[PDB]
């Protein structure tokens, strides 16, 4: 389901 | 562990030190730490003998190197595990059995048929397919004729149905000794059928006896 | 007070393992009529409506020898059944 | 003092077994939930008999399902019969096939027995294979009779490779008005039946059938 | 030899498997494996099967099993040929079918190699389905073989797909897991809450102290 | 033509000598003669097989019909040098362990250590081996070879070797070290610090492992 772009998107907001 | 001597074990192991469990606690684990050589464990072990300790002492020794360990060999550790479990009198027996394999078994199965232990000894004759040696004992110490039928029906052999026959006759039941020898088909010791015969009537079921008796000794 | 503390805490460590043994069996319970259901409906599906020149047809369908049954033994008699099956394949109407 | 992420690493290390059914009874009093992780971490240690024992008599063994299946690979009789009485209980037989067909150290005429009874058709025919499996054969087929009468009990009566067994369910059929599946018992049990006997009772001493096939195969 | 083994090969072209099963269980006395590889080849399944049954081939049995479906006989003849090829083959196979039951177990003994890790990591990136690697990974603690990369990366993901339950993990296993790898990914990951106590496990107190100063919040 | 007719009338005896002593003849077609017309008593093909290299099929073929004395005898008296191939081809078909562990009990000649292990490790059998090196450290072999593979067994058997490291000189640092590079290096750095190698300690070392390990060495 090509779930790389939640994984990079919550870490990052997370991190900011 | 290190240091071999025999003496000293000897020396330490006289019931002064009330610390002589937590050392025990302690060598159990420390034991398994050498994983190089039987010889520093055969030392060991010796020097436990020698100095005769208790049960529920060695046994646990064995159960704990010999399992999920490479220690797995059977030099000299056939009996020294299953005779302490027998003499410690216990169900650990069953468990090492069915643990264990590469052992004499015939020899252990006499020393426990001689002590009172004898359902270690049907379970062995079972692992081992020995159907006679088991069927003899059961009649000989028990003579559980309830096991013994369905022993024999369970396999298939001539010698365990002689056998049976036999045991059936030490009993009295001329009726079950022709059905027990009409499927191993075995004409020898026809002549105490007969002389049994001549105690109490039963011309009946004799006749097939001999009838196939006649087609395999002609007598 | 540390020792009522840890009684206290015990007592209610004895609840939530209560409350969570009721919870596993009521869920085990309703696996199990879930699985008593789902038998019942085999068991009501089991239910057909089969007989007590289609006759042939109909025996053959109950015991056809097809060449699938050579995985068992190499007998010769399931040889020459297997041979009698082939030639009365053209009755099939 | 209790934690579950380094006890369930801790309990791996003693040296006795008392600590496991002491953890066991820990995890039954307060955290059953790791009671799988835990006994499937202590397995290479602990007495299953034992454990089994100890969950009979809690009467948890839907808890612990999981666990004794993966111990089944030991063909452990207790554990066996766990299976079996649970998957009895889920009314489920395909397990029970896997189960009988993989291992067999367990009694499996009481099995039998007690699936007969349960008014369920694929129990009476895992019965039924059991009975058959115990070399008790004239037996299953006259129990299957009762309901395998749809080219079920033929099955059985050729597999048992006797003599005297197929005939009776040709006289069955002929007695009853059955005829529309001799020539598939005749097929089936050919090589257990004599064209001679089979013709003559199926022409001249019954309702006149024909079994044409049959004898053009012989012939 | 070779007439028979060109008749099993043009029985395996037009599907004649009624005649070829009664062929093999005979005196063939052809060049076995040699047809089987046309099998595959010239993708001719359902033919290879009855080859590698009666020869007791475990091994290539499972590459017609693979495209045949069924994965429980795909285990059977995997945990009897002991081949990484075979049981990486297997779990491939586990995962394009979406199955996790025989999945956990055919991986069992793939996570004991080194190298393999990387490859069953990047298959289960590809699909998604990290937690079913998660639940692989978590049974390899009981093992007789595991090593240093295993706990690694299970760590590593702990740290980037599981952050709830990497602290224990962490704590646990800091001495085993090796020090570059785990540091890296949690500098990527850009927690300072475990970056500190890390350098400090592995004496670097350095980057330890530059650490603190860039970050004094917790 | 001569082999044909020395099966006609019982002449094993006279086949035996002609398979070494003659070498223009093609050994395809006699094997298949022997194969097809069964002597009862045939052990010419357990030389032949062996000195063409064709006992990828001879092992398969005595495991199928009947193994009493065959490979028995031939690791007895013919040729012991090949007994780590035929181990392989029983472990190919999944043979009882026991039957090996009693197999390889018995007395050897010309024997070569190096492919019984690698056999082993291809087939992640290590645990067969366990018995004849006990033997052999018994008998008191000085061999390098064969305390190298009981070092790697205790690596594989989960535990802490590192008595057996810093005592037994007879191993090889660079294998031990090389197969725990990257499984456990700090077991590889004690037995490099054995074998003195100082550039594999530096290979290792530098480039994932601890740092305090060469302080404290060099």
Same mark, same amino acid.
């Given at each position: 389901?090509?779930?790389?772009?939640?994984?990079?998107?919550?870490?990052?907001?997370?991190?900011? | 562990?290190?240091?071999?001597?025999?003496?000293?074990?000897?020396?330490?192991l006289?019931?002064?030190?009330?610390?002589?469990?937590?050392?025990?606690?302690?060598?159990?684990?420390?034991?398994?730490?050498?994983?190089?050589?039987?010889?520093?464990?055969?030392?060991?072990?010796?020097?436990?003998?020698?100095?005769?300790?208790?049960?529920?002492?060695?046994? &646990?020794?064995?159960?704990?190197?010999?399992?999920?360990?490479?220690?797995?060999?059977? *030099?000299?550790?056939?009996?020294?595990?299953? &005779?302490?479990?027998?003499?410690?009198?216990?169900?650990?027996?069953?468990?090492?059995?069915? *643990?264990?394999?590469?052992?004499?078994?015939?020899?252990?199965?006499?020393?426990?048929?001689?002590?009172? &232990?004898?359902?270690?000894?049907?379970?062995?004759?079972?692992?081992?397919?020995?159907?006679?040696?088991?069927?003899?004992?059961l009649?000989?110490?028990?003579?559980?004729?309830?096991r013994?039928?369905?022993?024999?029906? *369970?396999?298939?052999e001539?010698?365990?149905?002689?056998?049976?026959?036999?045991?059936?006759?030490?009993?009295?039941?001329?009726?079950?000794?022709?059905?027990? %020898?009409?499927?191993?088909?075995?004409?020898?010791? %026809?002549?105490?059928?007969?002389?049994?015969?001549?105690?109490?009537?039963?011309?009946?079921?004799?006749?097939? %006896?001999?009838?196939?008796? *006649?087609?395999?000794?002609?007598? | 007070?540390?020792?009522?503390?840890?009684?206290?805490?015990?007592?209610?460590?004895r609840?939530?393992?209560?409350?969570?043994?009721?919870?596993?069996? $009521?869920?085990?319970?309703? $696996?199990?009529?879930?699985?008593?259901?789902?038998?019942?409906?085999?068991?009501?599906?089991?239910?057909?409506?089969?007989?007590?020149?289609?006759?042939?047809?109909?025996?053959?369908?109950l015991?056809?020898?097809n060449?699938?049954?050579?995985?068992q033994?190499?007998?010769?008699?399931?040889?020459?059944?297997?041979?009698?099956?082939?030639?009365?394949?053209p009755?099939?109407? | 003092?209790?934690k579950?992420?380094?006890?369930?690493?801790?309990?791996?290390?003693?040296?006795?077994?008392?600590?496991?059914?002491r953890?066991?009874?820990? +995890?039954?009093?307060?955290?059953?939930?790791?009671? @799988?992780?835990?006994?499937?971490?202590?397995?290479?240690?602990?007495?299953?008999?034992?454990?089994?024992? +100890?969950?009979?008599?809690?009467?948890?063994?839907?808890?612990?399902?999981?666990?004794?299946?993966?111990?089944?690979?030991?063909?452990?009789?207790?554990?066996?019969?766990?299976? @079996?009485?649970?998957?009895?209980?889920?009314?489920? +037989?395909?397990?029970?096939?896997?189960?009988?067909?993989?291992?067999?150290?367990?009694?499996?005429?009481?099995?039998?027995?007690?699936?007969?009874?349960?008014?369920?058709?694929?129990?009476?025919?895992?019965?039924?294979?059991?009975?058959?499996?115990?070399?008790?054969?004239?037996?299953?087929?006259?129990?299957?009779?009762?309901?395998?009468?749809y080219?079920?009990?033929?099955?059985?009566?050729?597999?048992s490779?006797?003599?005297?067994?197929?005939?009776?369910?040709?006289?069955?059929?002929?007695?009853?008005?059955?005829?529309?599946?001799?020539?598939?018992?005749?097929?089936?049990?050919?090589?257990?039946?004599?064209?001679?006997?089979?013709?003559?009772?199926?022409?001249?001493? @019954?309702?006149?059938?024909?079994?044409?096939? +049959?004898?053009?195969?012989?012939? | 030899?070779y007439?028979?083994?060109?008749?099993?090969?043009?029985?395996?072209? =037009?599907?004649?498997?009624?005649?070829?099963?009664?062929?093999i269980?005979?005196?063939?006395?052809?060049?076995?494996?040699?047809?089987?590889?046309?099998?595959?080849?010239?993708?001719?399944?359902?033919?290879?099967?009855?080859?590698?049954?009666?020869?007791?081939?475990?091994?290539?049995?499972?590459?017609?099993?693979? #495209?045949?479906?069924?994965?429980?006989?795909?285990?059977?003849?995997?945990?009897?040929?002991?081949?990484?090829? =075979?049981?990486?083959?297997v779990?491939?196979?586990?995962?394009d079918?979406?199955?996790?039951?025989?999945?956990?177990?055919?991986?069992?003994?793939? !996570? !004991? #190699?080194?190298?393999?890790?990387?490859?069953?990591?990047?298959?289960?990136?590809?699909?998604?389905?990290?937690?079913?690697?998660?639940?692989?990974?978590?049974?390899?603690?009981?093992?007789?073989?595991? #090593?240093?990369?295993?706990?690694?990366?299970?760590?590593?993901?702990?740290?980037?797909?599981?952050?709830?339950?990497?602290?224990?993990?962490?704590?646990?296993?800091?001495?085993?897991?090796?020090?570059?790898?785990?540091?890296?990914?949690?500098?990527?990951?850009?927690?300072?809450?475990?970056?500190?106590?890390?350098?400090?496990?592995?004496?670097?107190?350095?980057?330890?102290?530059?650490?603190?100063?860039?970050?004094?919040?917790? | 033509?001569?082999?044909?007719?020395?099966?006609?009338?019982?002449?094993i005896?006279?086949?035996?000598?002609?398979?070494?002593?003659?070498?223009?003849?093609?050994?395809?077609?006699?094997?298949?003669?022997?194969?097809?017309?069964?002597?009862?008593?045939?052990?010419?093909? /357990?030389?032949?097989?062996?000195?063409?290299?064709?006992?990828?099929?001879?092992?398969?073929?005595?495991?199928?019909?009947?193994?009493?004395?065959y490979?028995? /005898?031939?690791?007895?008296?013919?040729?012991?040098?090949?007994?780590?191939?035929?181990?392989?081809?029983?472990?190919?078909?999944?043979?009882?362990?026991?039957?090996?562990?009693?197999?390889?009990?018995?007395?050897?000649?010309?024997?070569?250590?190096?492919?019984?292990?690698?056999?082993?490790?291809?087939?992640?059998?290590?645990?067969?081996?366990?018995?004849?090196?006990?033997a052999?450290?018994?008998?008191?072999?000085?061999?390098?070879?064969?305390?190298?593979?009981?070092?790697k067994?205790?690596?594989?058997?989960?535990?802490?070797?590192?008595?057996?490291?810093?005592?037994?000189?007879?191993?090889?640092?660079?294998?031990v070290?090389?197969?725990?590079?990257?499984?456990?290096?700090?077991?590889?750095?004690?037995?490099?610090?054995?074998?003195?190698?100082?550039?594999?300690? /530096?290979?290792?070392?530098?480039?994932?492992?601890?740092?305090?390990?060469?302080?404290?060495?060099?």
């Amino acid at each position: 389901p090509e779930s790389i772009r939640k994984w990079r998107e919550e870490q990052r907001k997370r991190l900011q | 562990v290190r240091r071999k001597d025999p003496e000293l074990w000897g020396s330490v192991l006289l019931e002064s030190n009330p610390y002589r469990r937590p050392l025990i606690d302690q060598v159990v684990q420390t034991a398994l730490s050498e994983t190089q050589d039987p010889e520093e464990v055969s030392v060991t072990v010796k020097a436990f003998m020698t100095a005769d300790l208790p049960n529920e002492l060695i046994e &646990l020794l064995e159960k704990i190197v010999l399992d999920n360990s490479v220690f797995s060999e059977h *030099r000299n550790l056939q009996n020294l595990l299953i &005779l302490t479990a027998i003499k410690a009198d216990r169900t650990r027996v069953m468990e090492y059995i069915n *643990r264990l394999d590469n052992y004499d078994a015939p020899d252990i199965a006499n020393i426990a048929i001689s002590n009172e &232990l004898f359902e270690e000894a049907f379970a062995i004759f079972r692992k081992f397919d020995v159907n006679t040696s088991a069927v003899q004992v059961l009649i000989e110490h028990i003579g559980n004729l309830d096991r013994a039928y369905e022993f024999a029906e *369970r396999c298939n052999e001539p010698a365990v149905w002689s056998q049976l026959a036999k045991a059936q006759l030490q009993k009295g039941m001329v009726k079950e000794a022709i059905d027990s %020898y009409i499927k191993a088909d075995d004409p020898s010791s %026809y002549m105490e059928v007969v002389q049994a015969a001549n105690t109490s009537g039963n011309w009946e079921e004799l006749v097939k %006896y001999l009838q196939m008796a *006649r087609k395999k000794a002609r007598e | 007070e540390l020792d009522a503390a840890s009684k206290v805490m015990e007592q209610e460590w004895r609840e939530k393992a209560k409350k969570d043994l009721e919870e596993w069996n $009521q869920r085990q319970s309703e $696996q199990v009529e879930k699985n008593k259901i789902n038998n019942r409906i085999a068991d009501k599906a089991f239910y057909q409506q089969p007989d007590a020149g289609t006759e042939w047809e109909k025996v053959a369908q109950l015991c056809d020898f097809n060449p699938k049954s050579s995985k068992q033994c190499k007998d010769v008699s399931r040889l020459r059944s297997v041979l009698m099956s082939l030639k009365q394949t053209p009755l099939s109407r | 003092a209790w934690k579950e992420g380094q006890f369930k690493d801790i309990i791996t290390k003693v040296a006795n077994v008392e600590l496991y059914y002491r953890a066991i009874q820990f +995890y039954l009093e307060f955290k059953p939930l790791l009671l @799988n992780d835990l006994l499937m971490v202590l397995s290479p240690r602990l007495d299953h008999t034992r454990a089994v024992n +100890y969950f009979s008599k809690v009467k948890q063994l839907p808890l612990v399902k999981p666990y004794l299946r993966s111990v089944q690979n030991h063909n452990n009789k207790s554990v066996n019969e766990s299976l @079996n009485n649970l998957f009895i209980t889920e009314e489920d +037989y395909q397990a029970l096939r896997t189960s009988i067909d993989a291992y067999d150290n367990f009694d499996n005429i009481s099995l039998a027995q007690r699936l007969e009874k349960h008014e369920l058709i694929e129990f009476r025919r895992i019965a039924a294979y059991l009975f058959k499996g115990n070399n008790r054969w004239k037996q299953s087929v006259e129990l299957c009779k009762k309901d395998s009468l749809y080219k079920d009990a033929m099955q059985y009566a050729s597999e048992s490779k006797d003599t005297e067994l197929a005939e009776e369910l040709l006289q069955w059929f002929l007695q009853e008005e059955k005829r529309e599946c001799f020539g598939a018992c005749l097929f089936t049990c050919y090589d257990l039946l004599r064209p001679d006997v089979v013709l003559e009772t199926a022409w001249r001493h @019954n309702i006149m059938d024909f079994a044409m096939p +049959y004898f053009i195969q012989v012939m | 030899s070779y007439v028979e083994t060109e008749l099993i090969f043009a029985l395996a072209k =037009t599907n004649r498997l009624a005649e070829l099963e009664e062929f093999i269980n005979g005196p063939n006395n052809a060049h076995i494996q040699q047809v089987g590889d046309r099998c595959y080849d010239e993708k001719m399944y359902d033919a290879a099967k009855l080859l590698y049954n009666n020869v007791s081939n475990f091994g290539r049995l499972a590459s017609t099993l693979v #495209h045949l479906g069924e994965y429980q006989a795909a285990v059977d003849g995997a945990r009897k040929a002991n081949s990484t090829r =075979t049981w990486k083959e297997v779990c491939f196979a586990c995962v394009d079918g979406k199955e996790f039951r025989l999945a956990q177990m055919c991986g069992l003994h793939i !996570v !004991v #190699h080194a190298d393999e890790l990387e490859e069953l990591i990047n298959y289960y990136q590809d699909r998604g389905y990290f937690e079913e690697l998660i639940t692989m990974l978590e049974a390899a603690l009981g093992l007789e073989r595991a #090593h240093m990369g295993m706990f690694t990366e299970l760590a590593i993901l702990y740290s980037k797909f599981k952050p709830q339950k990497m602290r224990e993990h962490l704590e646990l296993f800091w001495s085993r897991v090796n020090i570059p790898k785990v540091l890296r990914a949690a500098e990527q990951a850009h927690l300072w809450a475990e970056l500190v106590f890390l350098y400090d496990k592995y004496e670097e107190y350095d980057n330890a102290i530059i650490t603190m100063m860039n970050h004094p919040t917790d | 033509k001569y082999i044909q007719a020395a099966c006609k009338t019982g002449q094993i005896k006279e086949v035996e000598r002609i398979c070494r002593e003659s070498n223009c003849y093609d050994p395809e077609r006699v094997k298949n003669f022997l194969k097809e017309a069964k002597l009862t008593d045939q052990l010419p093909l /357990i030389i032949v097989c062996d000195r063409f290299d064709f006992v990828h099929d001879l092992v398969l073929y005595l495991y199928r019909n009947n193994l009493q004395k065959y490979i028995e /005898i031939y690791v007895q008296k013919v040729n012991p040098s090949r007994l780590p191939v035929v181990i392989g081809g029983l472990l190919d078909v999944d043979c009882s362990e026991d039957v090996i562990k009693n197999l390889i009990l018995v007395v050897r000649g010309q024997f070569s250590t190096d492919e019984l292990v690698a056999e082993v490790e291809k087939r992640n059998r290590l645990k067969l081996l366990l018995p004849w090196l006990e033997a052999r450290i018994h008998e008191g072999c000085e061999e390098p070879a064969t305390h190298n593979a009981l070092a790697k067994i205790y690596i594989d058997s989960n535990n802490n070797p590192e008595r057996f490291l810093r005592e037994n000189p007879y191993y090889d640092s660079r294998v031990v070290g090389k197969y725990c590079e990257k499984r456990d290096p700090h077991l590889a750095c004690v037995a490099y610090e054995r074998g003195q190698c100082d550039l594999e300690l /530096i290979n290792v070392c530098n480039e994932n492992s601890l740092f305090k390990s060469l302080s404290r060495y060099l």
